[model samples]
Target: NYTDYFFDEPAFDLHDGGYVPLEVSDAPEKPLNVPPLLKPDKETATDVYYTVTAEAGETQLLPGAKTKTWGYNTSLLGQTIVYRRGQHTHVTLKNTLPELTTFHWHGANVSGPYVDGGCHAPVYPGESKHIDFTLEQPATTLWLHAHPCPSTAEQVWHGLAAMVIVKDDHEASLPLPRNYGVDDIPVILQDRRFHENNQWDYRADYDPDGVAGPTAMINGTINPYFDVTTQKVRLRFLNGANRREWRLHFADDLPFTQIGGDGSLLPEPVKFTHLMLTCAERAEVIVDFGQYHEGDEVTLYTDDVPLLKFRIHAFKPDQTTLPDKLFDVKAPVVDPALPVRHVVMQGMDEGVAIDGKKFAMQRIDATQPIGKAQYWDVTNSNDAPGMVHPFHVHGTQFLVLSRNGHAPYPNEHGFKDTIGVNPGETVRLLVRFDLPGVYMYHCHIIEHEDGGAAAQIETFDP
Candidate 1:
């Protein structure tokens, strides 16, 4: 039982406390705005090419006002970038804005520091850079976001993020919804505080504790709702928030089967009635809305606010049943010969740092050989009864071995790139990296992330 790892930890957050008793308003009962599924401009037998530009523009967040925002190829948030497993990805990252920026792949398995687009690689204004590498990891859903040090929180708050989906044989053979915008949808859940004429002044609404917006925005859309025309719809929930955690559940306690977590699908389906997704995390679920009839409404809520309302409609019956197993998550046996590494998440609020130090762009915090299974013990030191720090790593996924000497949660069966370590709790992981370069690991809460609660590891081929 995981109860062995379970200990008394602070269940409430002191920093996030003031944003509690969250304020929400009436959502416009209209058609939900869905981001277009991106198609690569060109593809070859050996490689797929993509060009992502970070540019600024004005969008109509409110009905009448033009809200200024930044995105990748789109006017608001970016459209999804699709990739096939076993193909080399050649990318040209461009910066059109007036300031320096970086393109960081949030959950990709690639060579890092430069190719991984960490803080070390900066795309200055009016310049473009290219990197090419073959993907050597399993297919999963990842993200692309701006990662300039000290300003990541402010940039993402202005909408510099998007989804990147990887397609492989395992996922393609499954009897699941694959039609984009029809049944499978990416829900970018975030809360925004709108100001004059639907504009967001990050400085005016800034909070060092944690930026919490009173208004909720889905897919960069205000007053959002969707039409659930299919019997079974797959919702890919991406908590693309800067700091807030989404407490999501369907109305009437409807059940949903969770298929994917973080980077890849679980070994088996785990049914859930509710879920909590923190910053930069993801969950994939299939919800059956069979009972609802035409013109009936199904609502999705984050706390008390009805964030998304689905108007059920007529469609061909989907009688697909899940498979006995999903990914053949063949985790390598933990080698006792290897030494266990220690990672401590220290401090609270503005003073947070990893390993009792701030992040330096030129410094490499740790180094390991390429393609070796090792143990990492991640601990949260918050003096107890204060907060939870969600630990995240880039360029590779890991297997959760234990939590404070207890087994991992049910949804943690396959692979994960991020996990929450509660106050005074320690999470043990088995991570074997495939690529050789420098990658970052840090707290997921963007506020803490910008405050230097981050570090990097360099993997070299011996």
Candidate 2:
């Protein structure tokens, strides 16, 4: 039988004293805002060029007034960007905001420090920078966001994050839903508190732990609903919250098949009635609405509060079944000669640190040779009542070996760039870097990350 229980439920964010439970918005429901695909400025057989500009604008989120927000080329969360494998893609990063910001590709397998878009690559106000790279990984749902040193959380709160979809022939040949904005959709899950005249005051709601709100926002829309026109809908869920972890489930305990997570599709589809996503984690699930008919209303919820109301419409049945095998994960064997690397996440809020020290941008925390695989045992040193830290690594997707010496959750067999490490637990990862440069790894809680809980590693040629 498929599991219905959430993974490590005790360590859920609901246990936090500051956990802001989502409440049903009194305002009328609006259509879920589907971010439009960002068209490339120019495209050739082997090259593609596009421009991304960070600017500030106001968005009408509530009934009263427009909330001032920041986005990439849009008033709110930027448009969805697509990249094809083996094609050289060039992007012009333009910053129009008052301050400098770095364009960080959360899961792209590009070289680090600059192309990877860490703290080092900053585009000041009124300035633009150009970068080019060819992706070597399989198709997946990644993201692009601002990664400027200590203000990343504040800038993201102002709305500077967007979805990035990577395309490849292997995933294209599958029978999955590929029609953008029709049967396939991007579900960017987030929450924000609206203050005086419907404005977001990051400093007011600031918590060193992580800032959160009582209203659940999906794709930048509050109290949103989707029209289900197809028999099967693919929902790419991204937990874009700063700190909250979404415990997701559908009405009537309806089961869904999770096909992908974080960086790539699972080796085999895992079916579940309840799923939980930590900060920065992504899951691609296909919901079969075959049992529902027209006029039926299906609601998706996180815990008890409704997130998205799905109103079913008339549609022909889809008989396509998912194949037993999805993408093949090629894992490199770690050398027995190399000692295991130990990384410990300790403390909370302002006291957060990796290896008991705060993050230093100029310091190279560690180094590893390129093309070599190593086993990293990442531990969360918090005791029982402590929070679960979502650990993330840049530039490469990793394979989970175990958690606390036990097998990883069934849904974690795929390539993942982020994983939640429960307090007092340790997660083993098989990590390898194809390109040589500097990459950052840290707790993904945006506040924790910006505060002090991050470290960088240099991958150099021997």
Candidate 3:
């Protein structure tokens, strides 16, 4: 039997049913702390245990008014998981929810599909499963979310997602900002609906593809704020939303320097006034506020929503600037012998499909030889220009070949896990199937992904 979790009227009041207040403080701000990096003297194998409880809680967004919500570690969102490369991660996920669920490691390069923790595995309620794996990939911003078949969008709406950071020696040697919680911050951008009953619901009256609420939530709080005690702050922003695209900018017109993308850092820092992020995408930027005074507040906003209130305090001048070259990115080459494959995304509403076929839970749509690079021309047929579709590929990072023979977006100059393919635009991508397994690719518009806009590709050694 299926249950509905929708609401009658979507409300955005701080005291509404769906409203939840994220913990923000101004008095002697909590230290943004990073977990200590395990060294050679430190044990390599440690138990990284966690408990996922799907329980209801209340948060006071406005004084004397409370709203009910659900969360993982805190009232909303989970704690940041920091792991070093070559260290074994042993996690015991004890499900305290009342239903079956699975934890999908969105972009971590784990050992295999089974342990990669995708939709294929589910941990029933009141059950605990032990997962052990080693962090082998370069430093990147990965995520974990609920992956129950047919209920992913709903569960995610209930605030069941968190950020994971994998560090490496190569990344640690960079001149970039390495402060964990202080100078460096993880911003998880999402949208939610608050109902009149002071409760947050995901399946009340929404479609299976997902619903976008009117309110924006950053790290599970509405109208949240952060204090800046450092001269230069590094923010790692992740678009954890199911469908919304974030157009981020500072209120003070401060020019931010972007140092990295989804999978790796850029060759150099790219200065930009506005930053854009689609579903599952990540961007790292540094903001310098040397000219600010004490008690002065610099607001961080996205499309009119005040995300974090940055109150400047006492800090020394920053003597560091981003380097000209951050990383060496080699574009993957496509084989000339193979024909250019075309993947057309067609239809909207309930009729979404990829390459003229709807998603099949039990079927594999494409196959590739292990370690072989191929070219795919993914096009969107949405009829109008600027209609962007975030295209994501599993298994490996790909280089953007071109978009209708023109260069891609400025921020997309490096390796990427997802790229925005505008309507009528044919996006050429160079994909390499390095790992042998069945991986999926799809339009990351959560509604489209749930409505059959996804397909799987099987990679095998030839």
Residue by residue across 1-462, what tens digits does model 1's lDDT show? 321122232344324456644465553455666778766768887788888889899987766778999998887789899887788888888899877988888888877778888788889999999888777566677888899888888888888989888888889999888899989998998878878787888888777656768788888877677888799999888988877777778877788898998878889998887777778878999999988899988898875677888888897787889987978898977657779999999987778889889898878899877778899999998774557677998888899999889888878887889887878888899988888888899998888888889999988887
Q: Report the error of model 2 at residue 155, Å.
A: 0.7
Q: State the TM-score for model 3.
A: 0.86
Clashing pairs in 1: none
Q: How many backbone clashes does candidate 2 have?
A: 0
lDDT at 197, model 2 = 97
User: Model 3, residue 362: displacement in angstroms?
Assistant: 0.8
Give per-model TM-scores: 0.95, 0.98, 0.86
The lDDT ranking, best first, is: 2, 1, 3
lDDT of 2 at 192: 94
Best by TM-score: 2
Local accuracy of candidate 3 as per-residue lDDT tens digits, 347-372: 76678789899888689998877767
Model 3 accuracy (lDDT, Cα): 0.70
- Cα-based lDDT for every prediction: 0.82, 0.92, 0.70
